[PDB]
Ligand binder design. Structure first.
Ligand SMILES: Nc1ncnc2c1ncn2[C@@H]1OC(COP(=O)(O)OP(=O)(O)O)=C(OP(=O)(O)OP(=O)(O)O)C1=O
Ligand SMILES: [Mg+2]
Ligand SMILES: [Zn+2]
Ligand SMILES: [Zn+2]
Lengths: 1163, 467
């Protein structure tokens, strides 16, 4: 096989220092003049910052002088001006360089927080600078005299030390010195010193810093970089079109600020080159050198000195470093895209689930290149030039052609805050008149789209893949379940659930009461003819199906006891569902679980076509219902004024007690709030008693009352719109308000919205409203910063291996919070795969065997027996190094089957957590951050460190020591405990390691250390879920568990035999190497470690790929600290593969990277 | 830190000169330059080369400006004054028969009058020291071949070397000494005796034994350094003067220290051209040399688009006029009002006024909510739009199909007349030489091919590329 020279498909990216020899390879000339363009002719002065000899021709294939203008001449250098005739594009590629007179320090390696030039020398920054500005000499290889190597001298001292040792002793000042220091420095020799020093002196103050430095040093030898190279002899210049000098209208010019920065460096360098041939006094050339140092620094990274200002303008100049940022996460803010558009969105309830209304005009412009081709592919246009003039003329036939290109061609729709993956969904386009985008009403819930002015954007899948990706992955009908909780995200929303609740309803005596109907068909015939009422108790012969056979629909026919409305709805329910699913009252509650069961029983397609029919019929009968809302619909209880006066009486007595000194002011305010709080609860469930049932009606007899049919009640009872907390503010009094500082005002708002509020009440209602808009505005921000921190710790996590093969898993129970089951077992365990065989109340009997995916049948076979706990494989335990086995993860998706290889569960975990983040409230959304950031609480409890009988030692010295004493092992553990914090440990009781020695909150860091990995992962999920489960948010523990896996990504070594002693590193890398040690290598020299809990942002900080880190971390430090290591980025990951524009190593691209990672490191 | 401080602090240590100390330095400056001038006058090659270059001036191979700028106290005087130098050289050359030292005194006299161009002065200075590199070149080869290679101490090698440094008295006569360092010099005998040719040759070109070759350019070194040492000494005393002057031209578009450095170069020139005998205060004489270099620099490197000085004074005319015209009117001048008050072609004001505006920071924040910068909005006009490049790939296949609908030699004559699928287009005569029958014959092949394509059957495709 031949090697290669030119250009094939690159893998990996290496970064390093640039030798001055390296820097001249890129340059195609030295810039020697500060000139830009000429000033009359706007041509570029030769040997200037803009130049045709150095960089490239101004216009395509035209020499600068003009003797060679023809496109024939290409690889030709004009004999006058050193210009080859190629495209003007090379003025965008070709770089230059400048030969510096005096050496110049690279600001980044001198000044990025840990000074590389500093600790590579073990020299302080206030000293290096003092040597760099010529204030004091430094010795270099001082030899056997009176002075050390890194010793620093002054003017007078150097003179006194020169008269004693003339030669055999060398001391310089300025950049030439620091260059010599790094040059004369030997890395391997200093390595051998740091290795003998580590072993000779045993001291934690000695060998804690010793190890910290040496890892960079020998990384530098191995890096290949040379220490002299942090001193710049050659400064490369950026191609001009990347800092251009384009003209504007009116003949005014604009240019990148670099040109002021590059010009200055050249001028001061040229002036310095002069000051040497003028043999100037050192006092001047020193000042010039200092300015050249300053000029270069303001070019590379302005801001780390005195911040030079731009010409005539107060603003500072944007340095090269700022070309890269422009503060944090500045390369991934977004990019504008061809084949796209947006407009206002409106309804369109006629739509099938998999389609969307696209304007005649938008679809025209968007598919323009498809129309052009499809036009002359059929011959309706001679050539493309006329094809344009056709669709410009909008001839009638281009419309009929547009349908042809549009048909099997999905489009993407995106709404503003893209929270989870459902924010972009692919639909099939329906050509519509008007300028509005028509959106299917069921997919509204996913997008969080109202129709109050919200807009959506559109995108065209161009390539064949993207069309199939949009069709098979992003399609509306392929994502009907939320990936945060296997429940349907395509629920009927409001307008529709009112319709079905109105249908599946019954009133006491209605037209048709008691007749018997052959089937559902004659039941719709009875209603559309005005004979039977939609709600009348009525027996109808129905047939239902049940697939209780081995995959076969058993039929059963009976006279079920239902109503006329529920009869007609049965005509929609598909095949194998029980008639019981519609026999009830069908609110939004019951109407979604109806939809769920259809998916779990009949499958995807029959569920999609179901949801459509539920919406069509829901809209229709909701519109037939004539449901409205008038002023008399908000029924105030007749007993309201009574309740008010009564609590108004109690407070007058609590006041009576306060006057006489019987009760305190703090008690009064507290006791008065309680009787008002009670009165609001009393008015509340007074109006709801009246409102709900007072419809007293009559059937053949006297009286009988039922659930009301009043408009505003049905809206709430069904679940369409409205909530009992809100209704209470309309009829009953509306709450107690909070005055600004946080107190709740002791006289509540007695009035409501059906009455008026007065000046004082409304004025007090204001603060709650404004702090409401602010709180909900801010908690929309905090969420968005959470999902960032969350994908930054995940992102690269992909379902890679099939089955890691483990029995390790967390023991799953119902949460049972104090009172009763705050979360069943069936929910926590459904969709997960069992770790080992589960047994009946009696054994010998496997009920589900080993790793089976516990779905709805298994969960019932579990719920039939009395199984109260199931060990479940979890992501935090998946033994796959670099990723997650498909088994240990679970099943969940917008589809119902076990996760497929390659899906990027890292992202979709993080998304599912931060998407509901808006709706939370210590507690609240920061309480989530506190957990995921692993933040230690202020006043923690201490846990029992080691097992054994405990006792107290010494006395009060600010710290009261505790001495534990194990039965067998060593007992030297003594902990200094501040004894002004009340303790809970029994002072003569044997304490188990991990028990309460004091009370109060606990640090997760302990939990992981003492009680284990399985305990901390349990502590997080149950504690964050308490935040979500309190707000009524369903997030599967799965997603929190993948975040936790990233939190304990790292470990710290305890024993050795191979690598370091204390370093922190990935269990993936460590476990991969002590598994490499149980055989091969040594018999088992393997090291032990200890899992380390990191907060998400601390865990995200540790990324191998520096391109990923230069995205969100501080770009200077990442680039410097990586360039000194000569670090290689192998790509491999997600973030970077986006930055460089290639296939993601997941999804459809997962097959590509798997075929690539194997050809690599092979032949 | 910040260089302004440490420069201010560095030169603040330098002490102001007394009104007497100014003369002490200008005297030491006098000595050093005069010392080298006496050493330049003692060099025979410096006399012959100055005569070499004047035999070039009388043969019209140069001008009198290219060699001299005047003597002590133009074509008339130069021809006879050069004969005086020629006369004084040719009498000295022949009296070496030792006692010549009385007449070599006069050769320096007539040579110390010549004020050459600074270009030529440096060359002769370069000629002398490069001639000393030639002397030392053979000096260090004999040292490395005797001491390092043949193991010979340096105490006995330089003994008979002083006063000689050319012959074999130190080489082939010191091998017969039977010393422990003697018999070993035979190994390199073949290597040293052949390289001695370039050494004793310098005694011929320069006409001086190697002894004299150092003696002269050593006093020239002593004198040359003596001047600069004093010249540097003068500059530092006035670094405050440059500061105070540069403090005036501050915000004109150039950094502060950039000014006090360019002024510091004006102060450097002032020390060179200063003549203390004219009694004018060195401070006031440097004021013009310092204020020159500042303002002469602002003209060059204060602009991104560099403009000539006559433009900068043209510009100020408009600004000073538009300060008057502005208030003097109450509105302000139209581009054709100061056109009259300017002697300029008065339409040039517009063209002048265009380029006077410095270019605009492309990183100017434009003021949006996305903090959009100006440069983010300047579109690429050099680019060919894909909806066009698409048709270019189509106009290709169009003309290729239409050209296969011609007679075979009509393609090769059409694709030759236009640039199609060939390098360059061909003059119809050049096409004629390719095709035997030439000239008018080809013009009809050209016309008839466009004629077959112009009838609406082959045109139907091509015509739709016109709009
Ligand atoms: N992906 C999107 N999904 C939904 N809506 C979007 C999307 N992008 C923009 N908008 C709306 O378009 C403008 C802002 O556009 P942009 O931020 O300035 O960017 P670009 O100038 O490049 O268009 C606002 O709408 P409005 O101006 O009507 O006011 P609003 O923000 O209160 O709705 C945005 O909602
Ligand atoms: Mg809205
Ligand atoms: Zn040219
Ligand atoms: Zn696993």
């Amino acid at each position: 096989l031949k090697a290669q020279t030119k250009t094939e498909e690159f893998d990996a990216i290496k970064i390093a220092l640039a030798s001055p020899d390296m820097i001249r390879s890129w340059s195609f000339g030295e810039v020697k003049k500060p000139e830009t363009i000429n000033y009359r002719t706007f041509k570029p002065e030769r040997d200037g910052l803009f130049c045709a000899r150095i960089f490239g021709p101004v216009k395509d294939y035209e020499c600068l002088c003009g003797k060679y203008k023809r496109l024939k001449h290409r690889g030709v250098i004009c004999e006058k001006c050193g210009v080859e005739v190629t495209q003007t594009k090379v003025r965008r590629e070709r770089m230059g360089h400048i030969e510096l007179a005096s050496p110049t320090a690279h600001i980044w390696f001198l000044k990025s927080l840990p000074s590389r030039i500093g600790l590579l020398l073990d020299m302080p920054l206030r000293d290096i600078e003092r040597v760099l500005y010529f204030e004091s000499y430094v010795v270099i290889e001082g030899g056997m005299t009176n002075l050390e190597r890194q010793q620093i001298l002054t003017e007078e001292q150097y003179l006194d030390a020169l008269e004693e040792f003339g030669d055999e002793f060398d001391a310089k000042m300025g950049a030439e010195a620091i260059q010599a220091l790094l040059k004369s420095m030997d890395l391997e020799q200093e390595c051998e010193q740091l290795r003998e020093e580590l072993n000779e002196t045993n001291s934690e103050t000695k060998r804690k810093k010793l190890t910290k430095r040496i890892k960079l040093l020998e990384a530098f030898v191995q890096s290949g970089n040379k220490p002299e190279w942090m001193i710049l002899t050659v400064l490369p210049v950026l191609p001009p079109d990347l800092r251009p000098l384009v003209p504007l209208d009116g003949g005014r010019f604009a240019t990148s600020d670099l040109n002021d920065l590059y010009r200055r460096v050249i001028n001061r360098n040229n002036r310095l080159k002069r000051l040497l041939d003028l043999a100037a006094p050192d006092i001047i050339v020193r000042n010039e050198k200092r300015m050249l140092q300053e000029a270069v620094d303001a070019l590379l990274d302005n801001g780390r000195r005195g911040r030079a200002i731009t010409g005539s303008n107060k603003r500072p100049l944007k340095s090269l470093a700022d070309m890269i940022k422009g503060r944090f996460r500045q390369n991934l803010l977004g990019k504008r895209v061809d084949y796209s558009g947006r407009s206002v969105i409106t309804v369109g309830p006629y739509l099938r689930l998999h389609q969307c209304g696209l304007p005649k005009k938008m679809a025209l412009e968007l598919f323009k290149p498809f129309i052009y081709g499809k036009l002359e592919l059929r011959g309706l246009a001679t050539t493309i030039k006329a094809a344009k003039k056709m669709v410009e003329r909008e001839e009638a036939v281009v419309w009929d052609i547009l349908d042809e290109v549009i048909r099997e061609h999905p489009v993407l729709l995106n709404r503003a805050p893209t929270l989870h993956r459902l924010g972009i969904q692919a639909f099939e386009p329906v050509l519509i008149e008007g300028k509005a985008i028509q959106l299917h009403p069921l997919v509204c819930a996913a997008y969080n789209a109202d129709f109050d002015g919200d807009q959506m954007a559109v995108h065209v899948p161009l390539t064949l893949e993207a069309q199939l990706e949009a069709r098979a992955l992003m399609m509306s009908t392929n994502n009907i379940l939320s990936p945060a909780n296997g429940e349907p995200i395509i629920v009927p929303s409001q307008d529709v659930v009112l319709g079905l609740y109105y249908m599946t309803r019954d009133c006491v005596n209605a037209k048709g009461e008691g007749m018997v109907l052959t089937g559902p068909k004659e039941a719709e015939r009875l209603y559309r003819s005005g004979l039977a009422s939609l709600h009348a108790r009525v027996k109808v012969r129905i047939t239902e199906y049940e697939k209780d056979a081995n995959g076969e629909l058993v039929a059963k026919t009976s006279l079920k006891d239902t109503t006329v409305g529920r009869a007609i709805l049965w005509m929609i329910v598909p095949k194998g569902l029980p008639y019981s699913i519609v026999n009830q009252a069908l609110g939004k509650k019951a109407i979604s679980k109806m939809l769920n069961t259809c998916y779990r029983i009949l499958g995807l397609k029959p569920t999609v076509i179901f949801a459509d029919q539920i919406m069509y019929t829901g809209f229709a009968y909701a519109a037939r219902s004539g449901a409205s809302v008038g002023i008399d619909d908000m029924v105030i209880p007749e007993k309201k004024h009574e309740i008010i006066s009564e609590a108004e009486a109690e407070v007058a007595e609590i006041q009576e007690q306060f006057q006489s000194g019987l009760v305190t002011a703090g008690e009064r305010y507290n006791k008065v709030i309680d009787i008002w709080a009670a009165a609001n609860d009393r008015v509340s469930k007074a109006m709801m008693d009246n409102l709900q049932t007072e419809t007293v009606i009559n059937r053949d007899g006297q009286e009988e009352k039922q659930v009301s049919f009043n408009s505003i009640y049905m809206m709430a009872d069904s679940g369409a719109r409205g909530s009992a907390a809100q209704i209470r503010q309309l009829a009953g009094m509306r709450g107690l308000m909070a005055k600004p500082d946080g107190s709740i005002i002791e006289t509540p708002i007695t009035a409501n919205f059906r009455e008026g509020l007065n000046v004082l009440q409304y004025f007090i209602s204001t603060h709650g409203a404004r702090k409401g808009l602010a709180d909900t505005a801010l908690k929309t921000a905090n969420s968005g910063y959470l999902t960032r921190r969350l994908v930054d710790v995940a992102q690269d996590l992909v379902v890679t291996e099939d089955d890691c093969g483990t029995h390790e898993g967390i023991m799953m129970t119902p949460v049972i919070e104090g009172g009763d089951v705050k979360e069943p077992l069936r929910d926590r365990v459904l969709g997960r795969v069992t770790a080992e065989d589960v047994l009946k109340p009696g054994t010998a009997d496997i009920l589900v065997p080993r790793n089976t995916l516990l779905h709805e049948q298994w969960c019932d076979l579990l719920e039939e027996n009395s199984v109260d706990a199931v060990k479940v494989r979890s992501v935090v335990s998946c033994d796959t190094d670099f990723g997650v086995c498909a088994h240990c993860y679970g099943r969940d998706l917008a589809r119902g089957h076990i996760i497929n290889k390659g899906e990027a569960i890292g992202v979709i975990a993080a998304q599912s957590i931060g998407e509901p983040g808006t709706q939370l409230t210590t507690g609240g959304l920061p309480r989530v951050a506190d957990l995921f950031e692993a933040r230690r609480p202020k006043e923690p409890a201490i846990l029992a460190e080691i097992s054994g009988i405990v006792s107290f030692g010494k006395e009060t010295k600010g710290k009261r020591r505790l001495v534990i004493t194990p039965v067998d092992g060593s007992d030297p553990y003594e902990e200094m405990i501040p004894k002004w914090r009340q303790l809970n440990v029994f002072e003569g009781e044997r304490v188990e390691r991990g028990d309460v020695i004091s009370d109060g909150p606990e640090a997760p860091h302990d939990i992981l250390r003492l009680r284990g990995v399985h305990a901390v992962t349990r502590y997080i999920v149950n504690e964050v879920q308490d935040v979500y489960r309190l707000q009524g948010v369903k997030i599967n523990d799965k997603h929190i568990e993948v975040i936790v896996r990233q939190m304990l990504r790292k470990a710290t070594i305890v024993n050795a035999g191979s690598s370091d002693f204390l370093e922190g590193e990935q269990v993936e890398y460590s476990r991969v190497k002590i598994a490499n040690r149980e055989l091969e290598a040594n018999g088992k020299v393997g090291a032990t470690y200890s899992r380390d809990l990191l907060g998400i942002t601390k865990a995200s900080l540790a990324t191998e790929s520096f391109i990923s880190a230069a995205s969100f971390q501080e770009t200077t430090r990442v680039l410097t600290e990586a360039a000194v290591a000569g670090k290689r980025d192998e790509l491999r990951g997600l973030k970077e593969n986006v930055i460089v524009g290639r296939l993601i190593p997941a999804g459809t691209g997962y097959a590509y990277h798997q075929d690539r990672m194997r050809r690599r490191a092979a032949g | 830190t910040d260089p302004v401080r440490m420069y201010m602090r560095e030169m603040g240590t330098v002490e102001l000169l007394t009104r007497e100390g100014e003369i002490d330095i200008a005297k030491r400056i006098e000595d050093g330059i005069n010392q080298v001038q006496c050493s330049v006058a003692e060099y025979p090659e410096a006399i012959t080369y100055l005569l070499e270059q004047y035999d070039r001036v009388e043969a019209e191979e140069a001008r009198l400006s290219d060699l001299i700028t005047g003597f002590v106290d133009d074509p008339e005087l130069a021809r006879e004054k050069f004969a005086e130098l020629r006369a004084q050289y040719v009498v000295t050359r022949d009296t070496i028969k030792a006692t010549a030292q009385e007449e070599i005194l006069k050769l320096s006299e007539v040579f110390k009058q010549f004020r050459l161009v600074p270009k030529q002065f440096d060359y002769l200075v370069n000629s002398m020291r490069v001639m000393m590199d030639r002397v030392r070149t053979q000096e260090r080869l004999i040292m490395k071949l005797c001491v390092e290679q043949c193991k010979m101490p340096k105490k006995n090698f330089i003994t008979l070397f002083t006063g000689n440094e050319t012959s074999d008295t130190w080489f082939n006569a010191a091998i017969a000494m039977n010393k422990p360092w003697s018999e070993k010099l035979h190994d390199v005998s073949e290597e040293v005796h052949r390289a001695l040719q370039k050494l004793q040759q310098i005694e011929e070109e320069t006409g001086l034994t190697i002894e004299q070759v150092k003696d002269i350019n050593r006093r020239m070194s002593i004198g040359e350094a003596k001047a600069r040492r004093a010249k540097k000494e003068m500059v530092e005393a006035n670094l405050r003067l440059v500061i105070s002057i540069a403090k005036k031209y501050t915000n004109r578009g150039l950094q502060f220290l950039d000014l006090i450095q360019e002024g510091n170069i004006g102060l450097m020139k002032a020390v060179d051209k200063f003549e203390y005998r004219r009694g004018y205060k060195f401070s006031t004489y440097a004021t013009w040399w310092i204020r020159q270099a500042i303002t002469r620099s602002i003209a060059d490197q204060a602009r991104t688009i560099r403009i000539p000085v006559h433009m900068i004074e043209t510009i100020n005319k408009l600004n000073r006029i538009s300060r008057q015209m502005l208030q003097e009117m109450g509105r302000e001048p139209t581009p054709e009002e100061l056109a009259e008050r300017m002697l300029m072609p008065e339409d040039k004001i517009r063209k002048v006024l265009k380029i006077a505006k410095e270019p605009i920071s492309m990183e100017t924040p434009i003021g949006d909510d996305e903090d959009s910068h100006l440069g983010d909005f300047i579109e690429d006009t050099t680019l060919e739009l894909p909806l066009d490049s698409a048709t270019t790939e189509s106009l290709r296949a169009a003309t290729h199909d239409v050209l296969a609908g011609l007679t075979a030699r009509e393609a090769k004559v059409l694709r030759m007349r236009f640039g199609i699928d060939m390098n360059t287009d061909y003059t119809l005569e050049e096409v004629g030489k390719q095709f035997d029958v030439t000239r008018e014959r080809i013009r009809q092949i050209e016309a008839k091919a466009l004629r077959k394509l112009r009838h609406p059957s082959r045109s139907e495709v091509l015509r739709s590329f016109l709009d």
